[PDB]
Design a binder for this molecule. Structure first.
Ligand code: ZN
Ligand code: ZN
Lengths: 458, 458
């Protein structure tokens, strides 16, 4: 729900109890054998980017950081069980990666998950600033790229989780709610550990993804579609359509959050989508496009949006990085919401089949004549998340004050998350911290909101 | 290797020892509970066709029928173990289907595969004609839609297998070679049953396939590609380009086989393909297309060819119907072999990504404005098989006289198999048995062979 920059987090004073991998666990990890399972395309792109930033002296964002609040005194024994069981259950915590001679990514996999163990210790005189630094330390080229802990106050405590994006995606929220919070509540309630269905294996997804992408050629229809999209955006993925200042200097990422609609406005907005022959999501991309139209007078809107490529029951039970990209194109010659939402809905829906084709694969298949290239800083990525019905709902509609923290590290792009909740629809944007980018983003959000409200109140 | 019509099979005299599901296994199967796993699109299409034919009084082909020859006396105990273990190992033998009061296909699944058991009995005084009829009896709407047996002569015996296509596809050959022949050789040598890798589950494939097809819309690129192919062929899949007989009367299927090349012509043909920027397969479709050019003076050649949609290691270890269809289009204006092989190769390779989209899903998504319909009799289907590298090799290059039998039931279409072996390249064609189709097919084959010879030599 709430998304704040880590540097602005002011935890309540209290004792910091933090779980670190044990020395034995670290030794066992170091001697884990090589696996023939590759990194997913998502993991691979991430690891290459992380390597490159390290080589340039830059500190790259690479974490998902959550907290939530509990009353009273934490049962350390129960929490230790919950965390260790969580780590042992999901195979994304059982592998680690490294680059060999050349840029080939090697996977190592711990053979016996029982060897994985984290152990709690108090950070005796750790200050708030030191804790902010500490929680942001995990990085993708260590096996133990995660931290879990608690801040124990007199009569309440706060639980924090910091997990490398390498191992997870937004689905982790729901999973943590069950496997930390519900598990802990069971144990302190006097019950045995909650029984869970078998976890899916992310390794299997990596294997399938490589088999599927290997079946593609430069002339395959889905590849040609990505090629045409990129060619309509100067050989790469779409750039943010407004000036963002000089991105050759490493500004940190800044957050802008805004409420777009209250509950009533949301109901009316969805009704407007339905009347236009679209759904809420179509309206979301229509509003992004019409906002660009208002500020630039463009005829067509191009962006990529993130989507969860899980499909089977087993994948739905799999923790890991399943995010794929859908290429959104919305023609906005008319400037009306109805046609924009209709066509946007078609682009989103028909584009789902393209989300399982990583654009890195397209770049592999492309030749010099194809005229493609990887994006420069300033690319534009959207996301629509329906937190009103998804398991997120259970978290969002829970009494726990669940919070997300951006690490506030160097930013090369604009990420825009539109989130529908039970009682409001909000937008959050992460972007480079300079006055030009701040002005552009602020104007884009203001226009977009005005279009949301205008549509709702027709 | 050899493909014969069942009616023309003359088994050696001997004792017919045949394995039938036991009365207990059949009753237990009858009370198996409903499963939420749907039939695959392939299974579903097949089952609808079989129901429809039965309702129209027609006898449809539905089997894969194989034999091979063994020296000496069959160890009945060892064979019994092998057959039963094969049936228990693969989940395609654990389900059966039926139509409910609606047009919905219901899957039932036996809970404990150990309840599955086949038992041998001698069919005393069964004549050869009675054995031909008997081996052709299995059908897709009974659970035990398979037969296995031996014909024991004085000093040798023949093993026969008749399995509903419902449960298998060509991969079964390799599997039987391991799980019958290799298993049998282990047992009669006194060894334990051979260790096999874990078998894949076809149920999982059905689930995955429905999730994937559900992600498609009429506007998805792959669907639009299938639609354009059908529209480029008068709203359906390609028809055979030569006249046939009156398809409103039920002629049985007829076979035509011809040798295209010897080994030396084969190595030279492949080298020509490689030089032309194509491969053997591209050359195969190039030769079919060029042959149609000489016989019809058409501008482009359109056909569908079969491909194995297995991709992951687990799918490669899964017995079942994975066959999909690739839309092949070859421009044939120039008449040169190099360009035809180039473009045909591109269509084949880039079309692999389309084989996982069932055309029935396209028909679901299509609207009357799309202008499609399910094909009428006379469609044309090719296949290229490389039996020099595939498991077939070991079977093909085995002392065993491995034979395939067509059941000689009603034929509505032309199926063409081009098979490369270590020492020759052959073509087999199944088509409706009337003089008109026989002449058309014969001429087509002659032209095709002549082009093969031209390309291989001078
Ligand atoms: Zn710590
Ligand atoms: Zn029998």
């Amino acid at each position: 729900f709430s998304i704040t920059t880590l540097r602005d987090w002011t935890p309540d004073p209290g004792s910091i109890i933090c779980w670190h991998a044990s020395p034995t666990a670290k030794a066992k990890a170091r001697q884990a054998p090589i696996s023939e399972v590759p990194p997913s395309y998502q993991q691979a792109q991430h690891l290459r980017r992380y390597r490159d930033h390290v080589a340039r002296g830059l500190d790259m964002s690479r974490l998902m950081i959550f907290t939530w609040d509990l009353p009273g005194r934490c049962n350390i024994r129960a929490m230790n069980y919950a965390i260790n069981a969580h780590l042992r259950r999901h195979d994304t915590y059982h592998s680690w990666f490294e680059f060999d001679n050349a840029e080939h990514i090697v996977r190592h996999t711990i053979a016996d998950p029982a060897d994985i163990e984290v152990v709690q210790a108090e950070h005796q005189n750790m200050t708030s600033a030191e804790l902010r630094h500490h929680i942001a330390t995990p990085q993708p080229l260590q096996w133990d790229c995660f931290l879990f802990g608690i801040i124990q106050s007199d009569d309440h405590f706060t639980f924090y989780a910091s997990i490398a994006h390498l191992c997870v995606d937004p689905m982790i929220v729901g999973v943590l709610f069950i496997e930390i919070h519900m598990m802990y509540s069971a144990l302190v309630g006097g019950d045995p550990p909650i029984e869970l269905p078998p976890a899916g294996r992310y390794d299997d997804h990596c294997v399938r993804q490589y088999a599927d992408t290997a079946a593609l050629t430069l002339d395959s229809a889905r590849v040609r579609r990505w090629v045409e999209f990129a060619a309509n955006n100067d050989g790469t993925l779409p750039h943010f359509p407004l000036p963002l200042g000089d991105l050759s200097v490493p500004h940190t990422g800044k957050l802008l959050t805004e409420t777009l609609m209250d509950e009533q406005q949301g109901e009316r907005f969805e009704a407007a989508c339905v009347a236009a022959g679209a759904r809420f999501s179509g309206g979301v991309f229509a509003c992004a496009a019409l906002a660009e139209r208002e500020l630039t007078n463009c005829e067509t809107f191009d962006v990529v949006t993130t989507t969860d490529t899980r499909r089977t029951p087993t994948e739905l039970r799999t923790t890991g990085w399943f995010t794929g990209l859908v290429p959104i194109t919305v023609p906005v010659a008319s400037g009306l919401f109805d046609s924009a939402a209709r066509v946007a809905q078609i682009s989103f829906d028909s584009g789902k089949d393209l989300a399982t084709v990583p654009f890195d694969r397209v770049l592999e298949l492309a030749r010099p004549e194809t005229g493609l290239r990887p994006p420069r800083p300033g690319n534009f990525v959207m996301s629509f998340l329906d937190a009103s019905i998804a398991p997120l709902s259970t978290v969002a509609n829970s009494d726990l004050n669940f919070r997300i923290y951006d690490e506030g590290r160097v930013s090369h792009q604009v990420s825009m998350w539109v989130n529908r909740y039970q009682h409001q629809t909000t937008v959050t944007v992460l972007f480079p911290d300079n006055p030009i980018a701040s002005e552009s983003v602020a104007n884009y959000i203001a226009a977009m909101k005005s279009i949301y409200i205008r549509t709702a109140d027709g």
